[PDB]
């Protein structure tokens, strides 16, 4: 490890059709080092992203005390408009499905490339933005380079509201 002084953990639903190559995006983000750890740039903080590809999500979901999903990485395939559509539906009921309606669903949209036989990136960036979502295009053809950005993005978004809540706590208890 670096000089890691805090390890935070974060359940991230990784949703999107089977044929958008979720496995690849995760495994490469995962394998890349050699549960997906990333340390937040310019900190001694490491964040372990618990990546729930949709039999995993289900296991989680029917466990006792299960407490919803509030972080998500939505993946689609530039090659299939319909894969994009699915992301949007997912997204909306993930927002609906939250036990706590006062915690915003934090998500990231990713454009991928299933190397196997159409979406408008154009429109996707716009939608993303309109819904306040970071948007990351992988499809370009860097399999390997920036698979990380989404995960790092989401992990950072999580980091930050940790720090938020933690300060809030120090506020609430002196003395």
């Amino acid at each position: 490890p670096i000089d890691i002084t805090a390890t935070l953990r974060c359940k991230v639903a990784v949703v999107g059709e089977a044929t958008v190559g979720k496995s690849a995006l995760i495994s490469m983000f995962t394998s890349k080092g050699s549960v997906a750890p990333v340390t937040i740039p310019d900190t001694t903080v490491s964040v372990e992203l618990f990546l729930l590809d949709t039999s995993d999500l289900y296991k989680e979901q029917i466990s006792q005390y299960w407490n919803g999903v509030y972080y998500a990485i939505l993946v689609f395939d530039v090659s299939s408009m319909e894969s994009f559509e699915s992301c949007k539906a997912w997204f909306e009921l993930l927002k609906s499905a939250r036990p706590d309606r006062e915690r915003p669903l934090r998500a990231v949209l990713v454009a991928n490339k299933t190397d196997l036989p159409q979406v408008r990136l154009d429109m996707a960036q716009d939608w993303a933005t309109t819904n306040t979502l970071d948007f990351f295009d992988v499809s370009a053809n860097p399999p390997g380079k920036d698979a990380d950005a989404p995960f790092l993005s989401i992990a950072t978004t999580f980091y930050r509201n940790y720090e938020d809540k933690v300060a809030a706590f120090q506020d609430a208890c002196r003395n």
């Binding site: 002084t5 935070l8 005390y65 940790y162 809540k165 933690v166 706590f169 208890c173 003395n175």
Partner: protein
């Protein structure tokens, strides 16, 4: 006395998550303004070990954002086998106090935060009374 306190040998040894800024030790310094905070998901747990295996008359916690909590004892001197003591659903806001008069011998006490009201939670004081 209260063997929770660092000074009556109180010592946490198997917390499931930590930030050096809010270490388990913050639970047994007897102050109300310091705390231990969880770093993410649930459940989370930590294991307090007292100087000797003692009789516990009353257990008591000071927390923020905890919803369901469970406590377990271990009277052996290695934390091999734990046995449930209680379980409590809590309520809203932003400090919780809890009192439990109990009558058990314990050497280790495990506290599990099974679920919270938010994404994170804190424990500020842990007190273990008995002789």
């Amino acid at each position: 006395k209260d063997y929770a306190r660092e000074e009556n040998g109180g010592l946490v040894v198997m917390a499931s998550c930590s930030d050096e800024r809010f270490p388990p030790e913050n639970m047994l310094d007897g102050k109300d303004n310091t705390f231990w905070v969880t770093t993410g998901m649930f459940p989370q747990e930590f294991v307090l070990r007292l100087e000797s295996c003692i009789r516990v008359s009353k257990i008591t916690t000071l927390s923020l954002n905890v919803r369901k909590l469970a406590v377990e004892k271990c009277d052996q001197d290695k934390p091999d086998q734990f046995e449930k003591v209680f379980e409590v659903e809590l309520a809203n806001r932003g400090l919780q106090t809890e009192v439990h008069q109990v009558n058990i011998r314990a050497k280790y006490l495990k506290f599990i935060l099974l679920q919270g009201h938010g994404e994170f939670a804190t424990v500020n004081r842990v007190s273990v009374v008995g002789g």
